Amino acid sequence: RPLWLPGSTPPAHLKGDLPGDFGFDPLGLGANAESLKWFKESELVHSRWAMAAVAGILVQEIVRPDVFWYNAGKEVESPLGPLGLLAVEFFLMHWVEVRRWQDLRKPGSVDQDPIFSQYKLPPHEVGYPGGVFAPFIPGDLAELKVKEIKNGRLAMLAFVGFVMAAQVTGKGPIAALQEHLADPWGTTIFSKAAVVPGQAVAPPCKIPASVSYKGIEIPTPCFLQGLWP
């Protein structure tokens, strides 16, 4: 079995049934199956969120450059009332999330379109609605799920590294890429900072301070500033 370590031994509760495992849980927290399903769900959740996020940020930096995706929160504009937008947002989200959670806590219990009785989703797996939720399927879930989880974990890493690269350079990830390409040698946190018993150094942040939006003036500190190297 392909393992996250060549030549090592998987733990107890890890075998390989669920895709995306290769015997990795050094803390062995996958003991309780309840929390384990909980965490499978949560990891799928985060992976999908982050995949969507990186995709959107990338394509947007592409087509509409010079718009700091990080500062889109600030510099967005729309004639619609922001309060109404966030209201619709909250309510929509409360609904969808309570649906998914009610189904998790009680499997196969909400599978119907409660409006159109004709419409009702077939039986499926928690974390795998499908049917209408997956109408067209080329290939096999055997590979689809493994690719899903792989790409999702990778995209989580992508998103967080984008955030770091912004906090350190303020540049969009593509800008930072072109920068790295320009100087392969000097474009490294290595070439940016280091720590020694004599003295320590860290790169300064580009996210300036409390952002002054339309009256609120959001306090904008840094992520764990003092321990960046």
Partner: protein, 203 residues
Amino acid sequence: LPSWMPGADLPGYLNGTLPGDFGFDPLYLGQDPVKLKWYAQAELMNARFAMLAVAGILVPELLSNIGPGAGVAWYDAGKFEYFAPASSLFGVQMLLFAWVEIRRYQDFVKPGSANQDPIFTNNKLPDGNEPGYPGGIFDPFGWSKGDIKSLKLKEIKNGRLAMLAFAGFIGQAYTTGTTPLKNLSTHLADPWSTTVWQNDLAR
């Protein structure tokens, strides 16, 4: 079992025998059967009264905003002549409302006891007593042709709805000092800046 919460856990006692029962009692306050009766009746009364109340609110407002004895705001209590002093008429009322109250209650405690005109013994209600649903003279248009249940369900539904309606009326009136139709027209002009938080934060 239509539930206020699909897949949830209904209480045992709630069994749909009353219209509008979606198994809703998160506080288990209807475990006593006598209490359940008391409160079925109270829901009915307060809800139906809220119905007729919000109707008496809306209708004359709608007529005033169109092309007529008065166009006064519904909460403008002490202000009208009505050719008679309020206190006297109020005493009249309390007596007569007490009259439903007493025979309503009598038939609730002892069913099938109040059917006749006590004056005109011939003039009498049938056996379809159903404490809370007399009918007969209370159903002169040949209704109750349907079973009872569609009308009962829509009844309890609209009654709860009207209770909420009146609550909104009084609350938003205390806050805005305005009339409900006007408030709704404002929300229609713009909903995007007419919200609770809009106005409580302007407050």
